[PDB]
Design an enzyme around this catalytic site. Structure first.
Site, PDB file in Angstrom:
ATOM      1  N   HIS A  76       0.813  -1.210   0.000  1.00 30.05           N
ATOM      2  CA  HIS A  76       0.000   0.000   0.000  1.00 30.05           C
ATOM      3  C   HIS A  76       0.850   1.265   0.000  1.00 30.05           C
ATOM      4  O   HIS A  76       0.413   2.263  -0.568  1.00 30.05           O
ATOM      5  CB  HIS A  76      -1.045  -0.039   1.107  1.00 30.05           C
ATOM      6  CG  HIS A  76      -0.649  -0.463   2.501  1.00 30.05           C
ATOM      7  ND1 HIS A  76      -0.446   0.316   3.658  1.00 30.05           N
ATOM      8  CD2 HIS A  76      -0.560  -1.751   2.893  1.00 30.05           C
ATOM      9  CE1 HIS A  76      -0.213  -0.504   4.670  1.00 30.05           C
ATOM     10  NE2 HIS A  76      -0.274  -1.742   4.242  1.00 30.05           N
ATOM     11  N   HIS A  89       5.933   6.754   6.610  1.00 27.33           N
ATOM     12  CA  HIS A  89       5.484   6.486   5.287  1.00 27.33           C
ATOM     13  C   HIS A  89       4.754   7.682   4.752  1.00 27.33           C
ATOM     14  O   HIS A  89       4.508   8.621   5.470  1.00 27.33           O
ATOM     15  CB  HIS A  89       4.548   5.267   5.261  1.00 27.33           C
ATOM     16  CG  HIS A  89       3.305   5.454   6.102  1.00 27.33           C
ATOM     17  ND1 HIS A  89       3.252   5.157   7.434  1.00 27.33           N
ATOM     18  CD2 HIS A  89       2.140   6.067   5.793  1.00 27.33           C
ATOM     19  CE1 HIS A  89       2.050   5.582   7.904  1.00 27.33           C
ATOM     20  NE2 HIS A  89       1.341   6.136   6.919  1.00 27.33           N
ATOM     21  N   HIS A 134       1.450   9.089   1.916  1.00 27.38           N
ATOM     22  CA  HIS A 134       0.302   8.926   1.059  1.00 27.38           C
ATOM     23  C   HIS A 134       0.424   9.964  -0.068  1.00 27.38           C
ATOM     24  O   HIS A 134       0.817  11.092   0.207  1.00 27.38           O
ATOM     25  CB  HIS A 134      -1.026   9.127   1.813  1.00 27.38           C
ATOM     26  CG  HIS A 134      -1.123   8.268   3.030  1.00 27.38           C
ATOM     27  ND1 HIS A 134      -1.780   7.063   3.034  1.00 27.38           N
ATOM     28  CD2 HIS A 134      -0.608   8.425   4.276  1.00 27.38           C
ATOM     29  CE1 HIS A 134      -1.642   6.525   4.254  1.00 27.38           C
ATOM     30  NE2 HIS A 134      -0.939   7.312   5.035  1.00 27.38           N
ATOM     31  N   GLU A 187      -4.221  13.053   3.070  1.00 26.21           N
ATOM     32  CA  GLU A 187      -5.325  12.452   3.804  1.00 26.21           C
ATOM     33  C   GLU A 187      -6.073  13.542   4.565  1.00 26.21           C
ATOM     34  O   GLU A 187      -7.255  13.793   4.325  1.00 26.21           O
ATOM     35  CB  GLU A 187      -4.784  11.340   4.708  1.00 26.21           C
ATOM     36  CG  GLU A 187      -4.268  10.166   3.874  1.00 26.21           C
ATOM     37  CD  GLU A 187      -4.261   8.876   4.584  1.00 26.21           C
ATOM     38  OE1 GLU A 187      -3.761   8.837   5.724  1.00 26.21           O
ATOM     39  OE2 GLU A 187      -4.726   7.880   3.960  1.00 26.21           O
ATOM     40  N   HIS A 219       3.557  10.604   7.310  1.00 24.91           N
ATOM     41  CA  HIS A 219       3.146  10.171   8.625  1.00 24.91           C
ATOM     42  C   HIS A 219       4.330   9.525   9.339  1.00 24.91           C
ATOM     43  O   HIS A 219       4.847   8.501   8.891  1.00 24.91           O
ATOM     44  CB  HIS A 219       2.019   9.115   8.546  1.00 24.91           C
ATOM     45  CG  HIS A 219       0.754   9.715   8.099  1.00 24.91           C
ATOM     46  ND1 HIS A 219      -0.296   8.967   7.576  1.00 24.91           N
ATOM     47  CD2 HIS A 219       0.377  11.037   8.101  1.00 24.91           C
ATOM     48  CE1 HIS A 219      -1.243   9.832   7.255  1.00 24.91           C
ATOM     49  NE2 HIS A 219      -0.896  11.088   7.572  1.00 24.91           N
ATOM     50  N   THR A 252      -5.237   5.424   9.590  1.00 22.12           N
ATOM     51  CA  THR A 252      -5.978   5.697   8.356  1.00 22.12           C
ATOM     52  C   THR A 252      -5.990   4.505   7.398  1.00 22.12           C
ATOM     53  O   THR A 252      -6.563   4.611   6.310  1.00 22.12           O
ATOM     54  CB  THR A 252      -5.471   6.938   7.643  1.00 22.12           C
ATOM     55  OG1 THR A 252      -4.185   6.639   7.099  1.00 22.12           O
ATOM     56  CG2 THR A 252      -5.459   8.183   8.513  1.00 22.12           C
TER      57      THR A 252
END
Ligand SMILES: [Zn+2]
Length: 257
Positions: free
Chosen positions: A61, A91, A93, A103, A116, A195
């Site tokens: 992911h 990591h 997003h 996010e 994050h 999340t």
């Protein structure tokens, strides 16, 4: 299994993880005019001088930069927190295009990406025990916008070719996460969740107001990663963000006037 597509993306997660429709889900939109300045909030203490990165992993992911969390070496304290939280991994997003990827949102603005830095409360002894507690984790969230390159990100960028597909990892020692921090530690804070599944409601969120700038070339390399495993049909790792969830009965507090 869960992912980010039409048939397995965020709008489906509640079937396997019913807490997806809970009372303290993340991310949220940060309404800057609503968020109340709280003079009782303390400066954030980010102590990363002894951080020991070990390895980078494509988990299908995102990619996680992992740290040695066996000792008190990279810790987050102060801010809204009680006690000491140790860095386990960071990591990102990100989007398919620069206009989405974050996010959290700020007055509905989406950033190109969001970093994050995940930390667990030492009073619970390990990460797996911490995620079972409402004050188990502290996640430091940092927005990314596209402009000037972030020199301190480039080491991460240049290892991604070696972890293109899910399940690939690489040695990743001596990386200094201080190089990913903006100048200001002004923040918003609220109680929320992971999340990603299992979406556990164990996080004190600390979202920095000031974004970092990364270059278009840097983000473009994120977008060359793959969600799929080696040799499988290629599906680019893009749009690995959960949209904003209902705020419900929560207050977002600002550290700054
Ligand atoms: Zn995350």
């Amino acid at each position: 299994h869960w992912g980010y597509g039409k048939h397995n993306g965020p709008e489906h997660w509640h079937k396997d993880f019913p807490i997806a429709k809970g009372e303290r889900q993340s991310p949220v939109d940060i309404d800057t005019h609503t968020a109340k300045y709280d003079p009782s909030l303390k400066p954030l203490s980010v102590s990363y001088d002894q951080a020991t990165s070990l390895r980078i992993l494509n988990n299908g992911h995102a990619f996680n930069v992992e740290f040695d969390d066996s000792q008190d070496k990279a810790v987050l304290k102060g801010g809204p927190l009680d006690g000491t939280y140790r860095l386990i991994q960071f990591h990102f997003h990100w989007g398919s295009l620069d206009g989405q990827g974050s996010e959290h949102t700020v007055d509905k603005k989406k950033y190109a990406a969001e970093l994050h830095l995940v930390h667990w409360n030492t009073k619970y002894g390990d990460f797996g025990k911490a995620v079972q507690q409402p004050d188990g984790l502290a996640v430091l969230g940092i927005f990314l916008k596209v402009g000037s390159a972030k020199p301190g990100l480039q080491k991460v960028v240049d290892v991604l070719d070696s972890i293109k597909t899910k399940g690939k990892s690489a040695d990743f020692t001596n990386f200094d996460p201080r190089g990913l921090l903006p100048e200001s530690l002004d923040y918003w804070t609220y109680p929320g969740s992971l999340t990603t599944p299992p979406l556990l409601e164990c996080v004190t969120w600390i979202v920095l107001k000031e974004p970092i700038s990364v270059s278009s070339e840097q983000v473009l390399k994120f977008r060359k990663l793959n969600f799929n495993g080696e040799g499988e049909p290629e599906e680019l790792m893009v749009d690995n963000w959960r949209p904003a969830q209902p705020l419900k009965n929560r207050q977002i507090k600002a550290s700054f006037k």
